[PDB]
Amino acid sequence: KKQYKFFKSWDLTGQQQFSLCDAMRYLRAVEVGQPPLSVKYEVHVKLRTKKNGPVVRDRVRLPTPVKMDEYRERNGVVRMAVGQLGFTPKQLAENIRVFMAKIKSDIGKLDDTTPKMVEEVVLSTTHGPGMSLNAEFAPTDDKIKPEDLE
Amino acid sequence: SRIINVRLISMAMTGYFYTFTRPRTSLPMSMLKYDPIVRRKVLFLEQK
Amino acid sequence: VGVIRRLNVVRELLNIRAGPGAALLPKEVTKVHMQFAHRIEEGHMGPRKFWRENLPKLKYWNPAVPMVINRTTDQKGPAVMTIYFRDDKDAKPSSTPFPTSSADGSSPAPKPAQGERIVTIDMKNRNSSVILKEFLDKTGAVAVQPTAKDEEEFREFEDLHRRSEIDRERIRKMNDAKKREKAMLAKAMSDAQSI
Amino acid sequence: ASHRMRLQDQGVVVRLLEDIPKFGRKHAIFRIERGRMRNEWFPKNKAEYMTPARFQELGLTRDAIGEVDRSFVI
Amino acid sequence: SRWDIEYYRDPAHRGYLSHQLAPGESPSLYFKVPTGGEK
Amino acid sequence: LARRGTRVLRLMNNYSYRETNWEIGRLIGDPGSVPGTEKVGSRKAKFRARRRRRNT
Amino acid sequence: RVKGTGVGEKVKGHKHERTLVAKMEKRREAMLAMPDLIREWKKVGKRNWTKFPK
RNA sequence: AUUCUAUGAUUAGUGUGAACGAAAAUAGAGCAGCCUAUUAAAAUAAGUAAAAUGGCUUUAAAGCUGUUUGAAUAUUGUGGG
RNA sequence: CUGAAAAUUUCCAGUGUAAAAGGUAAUCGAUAAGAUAUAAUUGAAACACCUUUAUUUUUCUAUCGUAUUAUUAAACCUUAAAUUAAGGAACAAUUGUUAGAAGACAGUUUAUGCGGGGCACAGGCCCCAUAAAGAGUAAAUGGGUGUGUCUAAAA
RNA sequence: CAGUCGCGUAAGCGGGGCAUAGGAUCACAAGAUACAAAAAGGAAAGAUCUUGGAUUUUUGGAAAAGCUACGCUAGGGAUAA
RNA sequence: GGCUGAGUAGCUCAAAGUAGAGCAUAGUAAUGUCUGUGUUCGAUCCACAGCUCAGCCACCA
Ligand SMILES: [K+]
Ligand SMILES: [K+]
Ligand SMILES: [Mg+2]
Ligand SMILES: [Mg+2]
Ligand SMILES: [Mg+2]
Ligand SMILES: [Mg+2]
Ligand SMILES: [Mg+2]
Ligand SMILES: [Mg+2]
Ligand SMILES: [Mg+2]
Ligand SMILES: [Mg+2]
Ligand SMILES: [Mg+2]
Ligand SMILES: [Mg+2]
Ligand SMILES: [Mg+2]
Ligand SMILES: [Mg+2]
Ligand SMILES: [Mg+2]
Ligand SMILES: [Mg+2]
Numbered sequence A: 001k002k003q004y005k006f007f008k009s010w011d012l013t014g015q016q017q018f019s020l021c022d023a024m025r026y027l028r029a030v031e032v033g034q035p036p037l038s039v040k041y042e043v044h045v046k047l048r049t050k051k052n053g054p055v056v057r058d059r060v061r062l063p064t065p066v067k068m069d070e071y072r073e074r075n076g077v078v079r080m081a082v083g084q085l086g087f088t089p090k091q092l093a094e095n096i097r098v099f100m101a102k103i104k105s106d107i108g109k110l111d112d113t114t115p116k117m118v119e120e121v122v123l124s125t126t127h128g129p130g131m132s133l134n135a136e137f138a139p140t141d142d143k144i145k146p147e148d149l150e
Numbered sequence B: 001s002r003i004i005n006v007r008l009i010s011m012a013m014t015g016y017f018y019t020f021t022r023p024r025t026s027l028p029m030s031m032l033k034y035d036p037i038v039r040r041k042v043l044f045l046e047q048k
Numbered sequence C: 001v002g003v004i005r006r007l008n009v010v011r012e013l014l015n016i017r018a019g020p021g022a023a024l025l026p027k028e029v030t031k032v033h034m035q036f037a038h039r040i041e042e043g044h045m046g047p048r049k050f051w052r053e054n055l056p057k058l059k060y061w062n063p064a065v066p067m068v069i070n071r072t073t074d075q076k077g078p079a080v081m082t083i084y085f086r087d088d089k090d091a092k093p094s095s096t097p098f099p100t101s102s103a104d105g106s107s108p109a110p111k112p113a114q115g116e117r118i119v120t121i122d123m124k125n126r127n128s129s130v131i132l133k134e135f136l137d138k139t140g141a142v143a144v145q146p147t148a149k150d151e152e153e154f155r156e157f158e159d160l161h162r163r164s165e166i167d168r169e170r171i172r173k174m175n176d177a178k179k180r181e182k183a184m185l186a187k188a189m190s191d192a193q194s195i
Numbered sequence D: 001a002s003h004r005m006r007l008q009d010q011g012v013v014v015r016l017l018e019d020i021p022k023f024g025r026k027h028a029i030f031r032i033e034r035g036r037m038r039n040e041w042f043p044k045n046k047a048e049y050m051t052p053a054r055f056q057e058l059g060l061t062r063d064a065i066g067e068v069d070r071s072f073v074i
Numbered sequence E: 001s002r003w004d005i006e007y008y009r010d011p012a013h014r015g016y017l018s019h020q021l022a023p024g025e026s027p028s029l030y031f032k033v034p035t036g037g038e039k
Numbered sequence F: 001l002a003r004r005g006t007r008v009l010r011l012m013n014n015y016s017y018r019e020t021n022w023e024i025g026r027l028i029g030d031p032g033s034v035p036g037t038e039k040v041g042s043r044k045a046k047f048r049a050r051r052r053r054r055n056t
Numbered sequence G: 001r002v003k004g005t006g007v008g009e010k011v012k013g014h015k016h017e018r019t020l021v022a023k024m025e026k027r028r029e030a031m032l033a034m035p036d037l038i039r040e041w042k043k044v045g046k047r048n049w050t051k052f053p054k
Numbered sequence H: 001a002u003u004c005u006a007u008g009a010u011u012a013g014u015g016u017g018a019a020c021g022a023a024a025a026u027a028g029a030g031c032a033g034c035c036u037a038u039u040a041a042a043a044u045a046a047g048u049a050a051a052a053u054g055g056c057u058u059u060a061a062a063g064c065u066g067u068u069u070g071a072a073u074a075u076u077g078u079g080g081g
Numbered sequence I: 001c002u003g004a005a006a007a008u009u010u011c012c013a014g015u016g017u018a019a020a021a022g023g024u025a026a027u028c029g030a031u032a033a034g035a036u037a038u039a040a041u042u043g044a045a046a047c048a049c050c051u052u053u054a055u056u057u058u059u060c061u062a063u064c065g066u067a068u069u070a071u072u073a074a075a076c077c078u079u080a081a082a083u084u085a086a087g088g089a090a091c092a093a094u095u096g097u098u099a100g101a102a103g104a105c106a107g108u109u110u111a112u113g114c115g116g117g118g119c120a121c122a123g124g125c126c127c128c129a130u131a132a133a134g135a136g137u138a139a140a141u142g143g144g145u146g147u148g149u150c151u152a153a154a155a
Numbered sequence J: 001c002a003g004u005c006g007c008g009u010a011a012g013c014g015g016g017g018c019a020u021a022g023g024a025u026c027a028c029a030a031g032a033u034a035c036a037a038a039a040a041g042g043a044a045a046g047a048u049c050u051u052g053g054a055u056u057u058u059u060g061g062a063a064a065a066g067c068u069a070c071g072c073u074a075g076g077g078a079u080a081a
Numbered sequence K: 001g002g003c004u005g006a007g008u009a010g011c012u013c014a015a016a017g018u019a020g021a022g023c024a025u026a027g028u029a030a031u032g033u034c035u036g037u038g039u040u041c042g043a044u045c046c047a048c049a050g051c052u053c054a055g056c057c058a059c060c061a
Helices: A020-030 A089-109 C003-013 C045-054 C056-061 C128-138 C148-194 D034-041 D052-057 E002-008 F021-025 F043-055 G021-032 G034-044
Strands: A043-048 A077-080 A117-123 A131-133 B003-010 B017-023 B030-035 B040-046 C032-037 C067-072 C080-084 C118-122 D012-016 D029-032 D047-049
Touching (some): B040 G034, C118 C128, F021 G021, G021 G034
């Protein structure tokens, strides 16, 4: 009977976000031995958008190829790969900034009636858990440092 | 109710405007008027 | 799909940092290699559980060492793992050539360099336990101990599964009771039409 | 939601001098309704008001106030 | 105040605070003299 | 390009430098005609192009 | 040490003074696009025009 | 410090209007400071300051106030204006 | 849409109750077999598994609200020097706030013009005549179906 | 007169309509100006310019129904029988 | 001035995998989603803009 014009927006005050390097440490372990060429990351970005508004149907040419890439908003979220398993944090980092900017550039390019603002950024693999992403990049643990490997 | 008072806003973003009346059952107004701020004739368009 | 839903589903899958198989390997080790078959036959179930249960716990505390796997379809293939234990007293050799994982045996065990001495460990028709202990005692490494917060993580999710299984059967008893009831209603409609 | 709401009292802080069932153990500090404390507990000497002076003598601070334990059992 | 300071801070009025200024500085406490050139 | 790219900042009131609105107006062109209304092309040139496109 | 005019303090500036450079730039931008706006308005025509401020 | 008179002032300001109407300051009359008050009184002030609401006063501040709520601890910058 | 556990998404065809998209070719089977999935078939769309979202439904929890019941188990109220008494009872009552509401009561308005006043009608503006060859010129004087508009110019 | 636009070969013409028929302040609202800013930096609320909404129709601009034969006062042959 | 809810057979009313049943019209038959523009395989349905509107606050200076 009741109806709302918005997508459910949960409270993030108690969320546990991870830095990009701290996250890959968790993911690279679950993908031990998996073919890096057949295991790629993925990002789901929840947007504070209204159901009535339009949708995004633009394309993006990332710096490094993962397969021009195509992305589309289906329901208050946008899902697309961002890098293979063998991607180093330096390469994977900019590979994400190019995706968020192309979005925020298309949002501002859109109408001002309901500017769709981002709420959270998730990161997962083809066999990994969905973990939240923090704006930070470096690991919180002082013992670990940027390390690249298979 | 048949005639409304409209405001033609300057497209030079100078804040000057001209006010004219026109029937509701008509198209918006658009004119080439003189802007006293920049002292040049620019294009004025209806506010709404 | 609330934030706490995704949060509990994650923190439970974060047992990678736990007691079972986690340990801080020494800097003497350089890299690891393993090769086993796809299926579980002719003594091949041991390595599989070692790959899905304890092996991931090493890369968390040892994210610098490359641990690669080479699967194959030959079920009789030798399920053996090599450990490049010797790094030449940490001489830091230039071991640039090294393969990558695969699924058809395309990345076999390469020959070690001059400053590397591998350590063979066979595993066939043997349990992961005997295979695990053989890895730690041989590759001398200190086992990390969990913190009290980790004990709560195990205790919390453990008590959670009690509530879950208590609900899995409960909701199951309402659906089957309905399925049965809905089927009973349909039978009456079909029977009534026959009359 | 609004920028101003109806002002409400949260209760009075008291330290139980006995061990009342269904609220808390002895020497338990929490915020209880003024009615129960004023009419039932204080006359029967079941609790005492935790005035700022009382906090000093007992050595505790205002950051020691607990919550009511409805599940408490004797 | 701002106005009273700026008045006696400029050399045009021979303000007694003008000595605190540099040759390139402006009397105003908020505005600055822009730079000429192409860049 | 040089004219439209120039910015003359003139001393005004309260030690403020800004571009005068009238100078901003003369950037597009000199006064006398409204820029944009003048026809850029010539009818004769348009006739020559029409024949060229037909010849080819 | 009073606000603004005190030692180490900086004058905030009036609102019309803070947005003075951001105001003349908007006016300058609109004039540069004036010839292209009148060309698209004299070609499209007064009736077929559909772009209006909001 | 308080009090009395004049100027400030048919001013600031308020109010649709009619009208109402300060203070600083200045001059004069008086002059006195204190808590051990020259008559016997503080262990330095909490339901208090303040807020919302209904009113008074009023220039929207400050001040008074019924109802419902409700702080902090000294220039080493605490509290009021 | 307070959150948590669990579950649910049927046009024909389709192995069958396909929620949607994105990623993937292996996943499960303690060592012996086979079940899933991919393939192929069907369809607009093809499935395991890992993710992020959508719809709906239970219990728990949070909130709000109604109805009822109990209460020297010292709220309050009533009789009562006024009590471990009797009864009512979270009502009533009082305070503050809010809405509705009796000329019951109070203040004030209800005008002026007009061949006396009452009833009635009347109040600004435009054209013509009366108006006496400059201009002006009255009357509850004569004419008028007069007037509170229209109008961006183009297909 | 200055500014800068249209038409015209040109002279020149254009500050709405062949002429004669509908309102202010105040308050409010939308733009500009950069004046002042109650210690100071800002701001609020003000000031100037442009513009809009009025049977403000008692239209130089009050939010407004009656009876008195129970009647009262001040005046008026300036008024009726 | 400002938001909100509605529009389908001639007339009534219904209903994202449909347009139904009455009455009217000629026992037997036929009758339609305000309009344009979008999304999704597909829209009475979701969305956007108008048209008609009604309803509720506000200007009434
Ligand atoms: K006050
Ligand atoms: K009783
Ligand atoms: Mg209360
Ligand atoms: Mg005055
Ligand atoms: Mg004191
Ligand atoms: Mg007070
Ligand atoms: Mg104050
Ligand atoms: Mg005070
Ligand atoms: Mg009366
Ligand atoms: Mg005459
Ligand atoms: Mg005459
Ligand atoms: Mg008229
Ligand atoms: Mg000031
Ligand atoms: Mg008059
Ligand atoms: Mg007049
Ligand atoms: Mg009689």
